[PDB]
Ligand binder design. Structure first.
Ligand SMILES: CCCCCCCC/C=C/CCCCCCCC(=O)OC[C@H](O)CO
Ligand SMILES: CCCCCCCC/C=C\CCCCCCCC(=O)OC[C@H](O)CO
Ligand SMILES: CCCCCCCC/C=C\CCCCCCCC(=O)OC[C@H](O)CO
Ligand SMILES: CCCCCCCC/C=C\CCCCCCCC(=O)OC[C@H](O)CO
Ligand SMILES: CCCCCCCC/C=C\CCCCCCCC(=O)OC[C@H](O)CO
Ligand SMILES: CCCCCCCC/C=C\CCCCCCCC(=O)OC[C@H](O)CO
Ligand SMILES: CCCCCCCC/C=C\CCCCCCCC(=O)OC[C@H](O)CO
Ligand SMILES: CCCCCCCC/C=C\CCCCCCCC(=O)OC[C@H](O)CO
Ligand SMILES: CCCCCCCC/C=C\CCCCCCCC(=O)OC[C@H](O)CO
Length: 328
């Protein structure tokens, strides 16, 4: 059953590679290249996931599991994760999926992303994670058809509303925005409309099949890399998230090769390698501290209306802006 992560990861990697999904550049392309493609893709996918997650929970195929709120962890970890993603040339799992494209810089970043996240959870940096955990909010939701017992607070739980209500309100506003302003300049057939539906269906399949394997969450990155390193160095068995990372790399590699876009590549200057390795370390430190990455928090947690995920994605962007100015 854990092997469904390979299939979901495979399909996930295809969607990432064909759409060039890099959420962090959505706010940059709209102001600097007049390209709202990633922005439209982001808001539309979140809206569909808002509706899809609550619908699949209503029919008993899954339960939403919002990540716990930790003000210190979500903010500081999110900010640091934003810094490292710029140094690492990071992306919406681009450190992961561009490994299958043939970018040797991504090979470094992933290694240092995996090591740093491993070190922060259980190694030399775990003293910092242990200190951060003292600020965890005790706010929780109780068991229902919509939520796993003990999950983090959400927009509806705080407001005391059925999760259908803010999901339908915020998604309707998101859909109105994505279609209101008609998108500007891009000729890929894999347009933001078809890519949002595919990405939402993959995220729905991910949430359903992972729950059957015992991991009650949707798509993620950081936990899969830790599970892979743990299995290689401790002989621990792999789980759904570990085989998902394998599938992502495999899926992006297949898509890049079929489209003629695979090529082993090197940066123009070797110092980029040192730059993306510190980025991977910061990404590993920041993602574990914040309790999720651009996938576990932003893509998967925001549609669940999780307060921790919305707060962490705010500082993903602020950390991105900060390091983007430091570098450029
Ligand atoms: C760290 C754990 C990693 C686990 C996952 C690792 C396996 C996934 C790798 C897929 C790369 C696929 C490589 C595809 C190579 C394409 C070659 C090509 O396209 O060559 C064209 C050229 O014209 C010559 O004929
Ligand atoms: C991680 C990169 C994401 C890039 C795509 C963002 C899409 C925004 C929609 C939902 C996000 C929910 C989180 C709320 C915070 C995001 C909005 C924000 O930070 O806006 C700042 C400023 O207005 C900008 O010009
Ligand atoms: C950090 C983990 C990184 C894991 C590694 C990344 C995934 C695999 C990448 C490349 C392998 C493919 C080999 C590339 C060689 C070109 C493809 C090929 O097979 O070419 C044969 C040629 O056509 C005969 O004439
Ligand atoms: C033996 C190995 C020692 C490890 C050596 C490397 C330390 C990196 C670890 C965490 C830094 C993560 C980001 C730190 C953000 C600092 C801002 C802050 O709030 O500091 C709190 C203070 O550290 C609370 O005692
Ligand atoms: C955004 C525009 C397109 C919208 C597309 C989505 C369609 C939504 C239709 C009905 C949802 C609201 C009614 C669904 C039933 C909710 C009430 C309910 O059954 O709750 C039972 C109990 O609370 C737990 O088992
Ligand atoms: C009860 C049903 C519940 C829902 C179940 C859904 C099952 C279908 C899922 C996805 C199909 C849509 C996939 C669309 C793929 C389009 C690929 C594309 O864009 O093709 C470009 C073309 O090949 C360039 O030459
Ligand atoms: C509803 C609950 C789940 C039910 C089961 C739903 C299964 C949906 C899974 C995958 C569909 C999308 C798969 C990815 C298709 C990608 C096609 C593509 O990327 O084509 C680009 C084209 O080549 C131009 O560049
Ligand atoms: C089958 C192993 C083939 C050789 C490994 C390729 C090189 C790995 C080196 C770095 C990648 C770090 C993550 C690699 C993930 C490997 C997962 C693994 O080895 O799992 C063992 C399993 O847990 C036992 O029951
Ligand atoms: C929930 C209020 C109803 C209106 C909703 C409007 C649409 C979404 C706008 C903002 C939500 C984003 C939330 C981002 C995370 C904030 C959580 C937070 O800051 O909590 C501080 C608190 O003091 C810790 O004890």
């Amino acid at each position: 059953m854990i092997w469904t992560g390979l299939l979901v990861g495979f399909l996930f990697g295809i969607v990432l590679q064909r759409g060039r999904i890099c959420f962090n550049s959505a706010f940059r392309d709209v102001l600097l290249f007049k390209d709202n493609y990633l922005f439209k893709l982001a808001v539309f996918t979140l809206a569909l996931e808002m509706i899809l997650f609550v619908l699949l929970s209503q029919v008993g195929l899954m339960q939403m599991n919002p990540k716990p709120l930790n003000l210190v962890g979500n903010i500081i970890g999110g900010f640091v994760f934003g810094l490292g993603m710029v140094l690492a040339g990071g992306c919406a799992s681009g450190v992961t999926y561009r490994v299958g494209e043939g970018l040797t810089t991504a090979w470094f970043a992933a290694l240092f992303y995996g090591l740093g996240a491993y070190a922060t959870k259980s190694g030399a940096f775990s003293w910092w994670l242990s200190w951060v955990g003292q600020f965890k909010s005790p706010l929780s939701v109780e068991e229902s058809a919509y939520y796993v017992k003990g999950a983090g607070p959400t927009i509806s739980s705080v407001l005391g509303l059925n999760p259908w209500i803010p999901a339908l309100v915020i998604a309707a506003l998101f859909i109105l925005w994505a279609f209101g302003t008609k998108t500007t300049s891009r000729e890929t057939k894999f347009n933001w409309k078809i890519a949002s539906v595919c990405l939402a269906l993959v995220a729905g399949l991910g949430f359903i099949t992972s729950t059957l394997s015992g991991r009650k969450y949707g798509l993620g990155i950081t936990g899969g890399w830790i599970n892979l390193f743990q299995g290689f160095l401790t002989n621990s068995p792999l789980n759904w998230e570990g085989l998902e990372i394998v599938g992502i790399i495999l899926g992006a590699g297949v898509a890049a090769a079929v489209a003629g876009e695979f090529k082993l590549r090197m940066p123009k200057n070797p110092v980029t390698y040192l730059q993306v390795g510190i980025g991977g370390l910061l990404m590993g430190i920041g993602a574990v501290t914040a309790g999720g990455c651009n996938i576990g928090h932003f893509l998967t947690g925001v549609p669940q209306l999780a307060l921790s995920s919305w707060l962490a994605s705010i500082f993903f962007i602020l950390g991105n802006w900060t390091m983007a100015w430091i570098l450029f």
